Amino acid sequence: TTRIGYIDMEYILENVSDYKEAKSQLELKAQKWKQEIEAKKLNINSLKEGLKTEKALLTKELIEERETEIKFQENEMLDYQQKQFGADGNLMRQKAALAKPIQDQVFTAVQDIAEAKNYDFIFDKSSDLTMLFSNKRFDISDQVIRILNRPAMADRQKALDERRAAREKLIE
Amino acid sequence: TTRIGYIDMEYILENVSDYKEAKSQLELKAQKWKQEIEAKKLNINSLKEGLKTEKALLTKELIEERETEIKFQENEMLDYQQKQFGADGNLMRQKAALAKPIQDQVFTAVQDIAEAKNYDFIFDKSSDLTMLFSNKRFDISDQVIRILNRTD
Amino acid sequence: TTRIGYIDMEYILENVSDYKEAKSQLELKAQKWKQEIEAKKLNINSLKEGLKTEKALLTKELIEERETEIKFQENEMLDYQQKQFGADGNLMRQKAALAKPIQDQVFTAVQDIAEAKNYDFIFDKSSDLTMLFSNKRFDISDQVIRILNRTDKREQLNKKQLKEQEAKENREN
Amino acid sequence: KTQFSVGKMELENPPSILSAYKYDPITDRYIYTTSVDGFSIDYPLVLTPKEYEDLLLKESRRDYFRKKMDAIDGKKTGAEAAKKDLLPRYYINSSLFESIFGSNTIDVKPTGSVEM
Amino acid sequence: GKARYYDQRFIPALEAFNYILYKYPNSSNIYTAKIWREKTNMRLGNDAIVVKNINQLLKKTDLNKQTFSDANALLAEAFLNLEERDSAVAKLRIAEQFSRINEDRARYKFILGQMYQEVGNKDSATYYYDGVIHMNRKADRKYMMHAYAKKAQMYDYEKGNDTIFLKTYNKLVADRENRPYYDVLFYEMGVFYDKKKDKENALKFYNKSLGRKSKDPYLMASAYRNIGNMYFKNTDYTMAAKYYDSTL
Amino acid sequence: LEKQVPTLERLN
Ligand SMILES: *[C@H]1O[C@H](CO)[C@@H](O)[C@H](O)[C@@H]1O
Ligand SMILES: *[C@H]1O[C@H](CO)[C@@H](O)[C@H](O)[C@@H]1O
Ligand SMILES: *[C@H]1O[C@H](CO)[C@@H](O)[C@H](O)[C@@H]1O
Ligand SMILES: *[C@H]1O[C@H](CO)[C@@H](O)[C@H](O)[C@@H]1O
């Protein structure tokens, strides 16, 4: 009265092209952010070199003012890095936005199969919790993939009956 | 004959107490500490660059003391980072003090419910990575929440 | 309905004597490596003190050679420390490889137990925190430990015992 | 309808974002840092020996089990290489299985002439 | 398991041996599986466990002579990894005593001689090297020729008889069966003449060893370096530099 | 010297 199946999301996502496209888009966005940060680093290094080339000529007040300007630029860089790659913003949001459609398709397929087969829980075989044994007939990964990408005597007798029916129907 | 339930630890934690606001405050403090560490790293790098610029004018003796000062600053930053962000202390200790009494109370309530109602397995759905789908009929978190609220 | 069993890998590893002895030997080897690192540090400090004591009597070239030798010794010590105690160093890699044969034996025993007793799923309870409450009736860890001890302390049957076993198993035909 | 409690699936970090453990011998600690180009994305996690060791052993055991059952299953794009280090009890491969004849091809051909 | 072991894939080999010990209690290969599991563990760096388990097995098993020798060789290797020279020597002595394969016996006697020479016991080292020599054609000639080389290394330069040594090694190096090892012999002779302060003969025999084209790079390098040192100690630094360039 | 040639070029 309580049935459990498993999904093995790694294998399923290996068979979805949208997953690879989303990974490529995320990598492209990360590269764009890295290029912007590198441009800011180049500007800051140019400012540092400009201050260094005159550190032995001007007085202390000008040196201190230029150092404060450099520190302000570095703080602006740190703020930009925390905004782009930080723990909240423009990377978590981008990841969630890219993963929302794939999650929608995969979870719609999984929910359809779970409702059809009356499963109460659907574990993930590729998660942190490891199953050393699985009954292998509760694995619904192949059915999910098919949905996304869209007693030998008895078998022999069924094949013979199907052949007879097909041969009878084809000629008439 | 096998009876299985599950709980959502995050949902119970948010319902019984003001866990979200305290967690957000702790996250803000941790971000402030991380920014302080980054500022210390920037200051150390600036000191290293300044020492590198002035080497000929030095007697190799003030160079030694400047290197020791830089090493002292680096060690101070490292010990501050370990104290604030160690596996035990000032972030993990604060998070533990935030979520440990309620976690122990939830564990005790879950054990009591399991013994009384003869549950065989109680799963924790809070990870959201394992346990992708749950029937929500084998959900005992309202019972855990009511048991927690019964205690003052 | 589904039948669920589980093991506790930490418990199983705790109840295996050879694993504990191997871990102790690994700790002893790590202590020996730390002593070697301390000896390297002592040599480096002796070189630095020797250079400092007579730094005035040396020319610039000789000072440069002594400083390069000290830097080479320091870099060698750092390389040895990273190679032995790094995140993927000798110590950590050898620690991770200790339980692999035990994991193989546990996996085989779990497959056999789940075949024998009609278990649909067997979980590793210690892999994550998903399993909050687990009834001890479904814990097959002690059975796995019994199996592991049985294969560890195996004994070859005698000629009389082998003949008796052949006669017993040949009674079907 | 059964009103499922849906979990979640998320993308992993792009390869440009490194995430690694570094051993600091000055304090004898292991620091986990997730950085893009040296900028710590989250809080560093510094642990003692026997604190890094427990987590490393846990993840290594999990990875060993996962790789073994991935090799057993076979449909994971890389399980064929790992099948060699498997116990042959857990899989059957057809490369060393042959039919009554080595293949199903028929190649017996005639050459010459016939006269009436 | 054996094929995986000799392929140096030790974890799967151990898995196969453990499966033998787990699934087949009525098998007649239980002791062979145990010994193979122990040597796989030794290859995995568990020498203390290997010593414990092999001692347990050898306590009451009265197993076959060849497997007894194999177990003692495994014990000797495990003790070597534990840095216990005396235990390794005793175990290798037992393994050589109980061995039935002539190649293994010659290798074990050579390793025993090497152990005693490393410790400094030239009497026992000479005993075991002479034991290798006494196995004349029952084993590979490399063991006998290198035993002669190591006997030359342990020559007593204060009280030893130069005439007997010279006649023995001249007879050795004027033999057709010893050609593939002439270099190893020639170098040794040069070393002898190097330590008797006879630079002409030392240079001649070093040159002979070099002209033998050893195919072992370190023997060629050692001969070049020894000639370079002979020239350096003679205040001839141009030739010393040339020969150092040669050995580099 | 080559670090101060640019500021020599720079004027006003
Ligand atoms: C191996 O055996 C030697 C002598 O047999 C001992 O001295 C050693 O301590 C180890 O037990
Ligand atoms: C090795 O063997 C020689 C000859 O048997 C002994 O004299 C020596 O003391 C060591 O035991
Ligand atoms: C070795 O001994 C012979 C005589 O036995 C000597 O003639 C020779 O010079 C060397 O001393
Ligand atoms: C080093 O020097 C020796 C001297 O003869 C050469 O034979 C060798 O080829 C290398 O040039």
How does DSSP assign F1-12, residue by residue? -TTTHHHHH---
Cα B143 to the chain's mean position, in Å? 27
Residue with token string 């205040």:
E235
Which own/partner contact pairs does E202-205 have at CB distance under 8 Å and 24+ positions apart? E202/E226, E202/E230, E203/E227, E203/E230
Interatomic CA distance for residues E20 and E34, integer angstroms: 9
User: What is the spatial distance between Cα C66 and Cα C59, in angstroms, rounded to a whole number?
Assistant: 11
**Structure determination method:** cryo-EM
Distance between CA atoms of B60 and B45, rounded to whole angstroms? 20
CB D20 within 8 A of CB A18: no
Nearest alpha carbon to residue E53 among A153, D70, C154: C154
Nearest to A12 by CA among E11, D73, B56: D73
Which two three-digit tokens encode residue B62? 């003030």
> Beta strand B121-124 with D18-24: parallel, antiparallel or unpaired?
unpaired
Measured CB to CB, residues of chain D less than 8 Å from chain E are 85-87, 89
Decide if E33 contacts E17 (C-beta within 8 A). Answer: yes
Residue B118 backbone zone (phi > 0: left; psi -120 to 50: alpha; other: beta)? left
Alpha-carbon distance B122 to C129, whole Å? 11
Nearest residue to E75 (alpha-carbon basis) of E125, E41, E110, E115: E41
Cα separation, E161 vs E150, in Å, equals 17
8 Å CB contact between C104 and C74:
no
* CA quadruple C102, E46, D57, C133: dihedral sign: positive
Structure tokens of E67? 């497997």
The protein residue whose alpha carbon is closest to atom 5 in ligand 1 is: E87
What is the Cα–Cα distance from F7 to F12, expressed in whole angstroms? 11
- CA E123 / ligand 3 centre spacing (Å): 24
Inter-axis angle of helices E10-23 and C141-152, to 10 degrees?
90
Nearest ligand 3 atom to the CA of E164 is 1
Angle among Cα A13, A15, A16 to the nearest 5 degrees reads 70
Q: Of A49, A26, A171, which Cα lies nearest the Cα of A99?
A: A26
Distance CA E241, CA E232 (A): 8
The DSSP element (H or E) to which D19 belongs, if any, is strand D18-24
Q: Residue E200 is encoded by which pair of tokens?
A: 């002409």
What torsion do the CA atoms of E174, E177, E178, E181 make, to the nearest 10 degrees? 150
Does any ligand 4 atom lie closer than 6 A to the CB of residue E231? Answer: no
Query: Could you tell me which residues come within 8 angstroms of residue E196 by beta carbon, excluding any fewer than 6 positions away?
Result: E157, E162
DSSP letter at C139? B
What is the helix (H) or strand (E) element at residue D24, kind and residue range?
A: strand D18-24
Q: Please give, one letter per residue, the 3-state secondary structure of chain A.
A: CCCEEECCHHHHHCCCHHHHHHHHHHHHHHHHHHHHHHHHHHHHHHHHHHHHCCCCCCCHHHHHHHHHHHHHHHHHHHHHHHHHCCCCCCCHHHHHHHHHHHHHHHHHHHHHHHHHHCCCEEECCCCCCCEEEECCCCECHHHHHHHHHCCHHHHHHHHHHHHHHHHHHHHC
- Helix E47-59, helix C17-53: angle, nearest 10: 140
Interface probe, candidates B6, B91, B126, B136, chain D, greatest D C-beta count within 10 A: B136
Sheet holding A4-6, edge to edge: A4-6, A121-123, B133-134
- Say if the Cβ atoms of E22 and C109 lie within 8 Å: yes
The candidate with the shortest Cα–Cα distance to C122, out of A140, A136, B114, D59, is A136
- Looking at residue A81, its amino acid is Q
Give the separation between CA C21 and CA A119, rounded to whole angstroms.
45
DSSP string of B33-62?
Answer: HHHHHHHHHHHHHHHHHHHHHSSTTS-SHH
How many whole angstroms separate alpha carbon E214 and alpha carbon D77?
A: 49
For the CA of E244, the nearest ligand:
4
Closest CA to A123 of A134, D62, A102, D61: A134
* Closest by Cα among D13, D42, D7, B132 to A95: D13
Regarding beta strands B121-124 and A131-134, do their DSSP bridges make them parallel or antiparallel, or are they unpaired?
A: unpaired
CA geometry: angle at A81 spanning A77 and A85, to 5°? 170
Among candidate residues E208, E155, E217, E159, the one with its CA nearest the CA of residue E182: E208
Cα A91 to Cα A9, B30, D41: the distances in Å are: 23, 19, 10
**How far apart are alpha carbons B117 and B136 in whole angstroms?**
17
Please name every residue paired with D46 in a beta bridge, in sequence order, or none if there are none: B86, D31
On whether the CB atoms of residues C100 and D64 are closer than 8 A, the answer is yes
The partner residues of D23 in beta bridges, in order of sequence, read D30
Q: How far is CA D8 from CA A130, B131, E200, in A?
A: 18, 9, 85
d(Cα B120, Cα F2) in Å, to the nearest integer? 80
Which residue type does C14 have? Answer: E
Residues contacting E143, CB < 8 A, separation 6+: E106, E107, E109, E110, E132, E135
Question: Closest Cα of chain A to D4: distance in Å?
Answer: 8
How far D55 CA lies from chain B's nearest CA (Å)?
12
Q: Are B70 and B43 in contact (CB under 8 A)?
A: no
Residues 6 or more apart in contact with residue C64 via CB below 8 angstroms: none
Residues of B in contact with A71 (CB under 8 A): 42
Strand C131-134 versus strand B121-124 pairing type: antiparallel
Distance separating the N- and C-terminal Cα atoms of chain F: 20
List residues bridging with B122 in a β-sheet: B5, C133
**Among the atoms of ligand 3, which is closest to the Cα of residue E162?**
1
Q: What is the resolution of this structure in A?
A: 2.2
Instruction: Identify which of E25, E5, E21 has the alpha carbon closest to the alpha carbon of residue E13.
Output: E5
CB proximity list for A92: less than 8 A, separation 6 or greater: none
State how far the alpha carbon of B100 is from the alpha carbons of A9, B87, B89, B92, B107, in Å: 32, 15, 14, 11, 10
**Nearest 5°: CA angle at A139, between A134 and A141?**
140
Does the distance separating the beta carbons of C151 and E30 come in below 8 Å? Answer: no
Cβ of E225 below 6 Å from ligand 4: no
Distance CA D45, CA E191 (A): 60
CB B40 within 8 A of CB B80: yes
Long-range contacts of C74-83 (CB under 8 A, 24+ apart): C74/C44, C76/C40, C77/C37, C77/C40, C77/C41, C77/C44, C78/D25, C80/C36, C80/C37, C80/C40, C81/C37, C81/D23, C81/D25, C82/D23, C82/D25
Question: How many Å apart are CA E57 and CA E204, to the nearest integer?
Answer: 56
The contacts of residue D17 (CB under 8 Å, 6+ apart) are A30, A85, D34, D35, D36, D41
CA A123 from centroid of its chain's CA atoms:
19
Q: C114 burial class (0-12, 13-18, 19+ CB within 10 angstroms)?
A: buried
Q: Which residues contact C143 (CB under 8 A, 6 or more apart)?
A: C109, C113
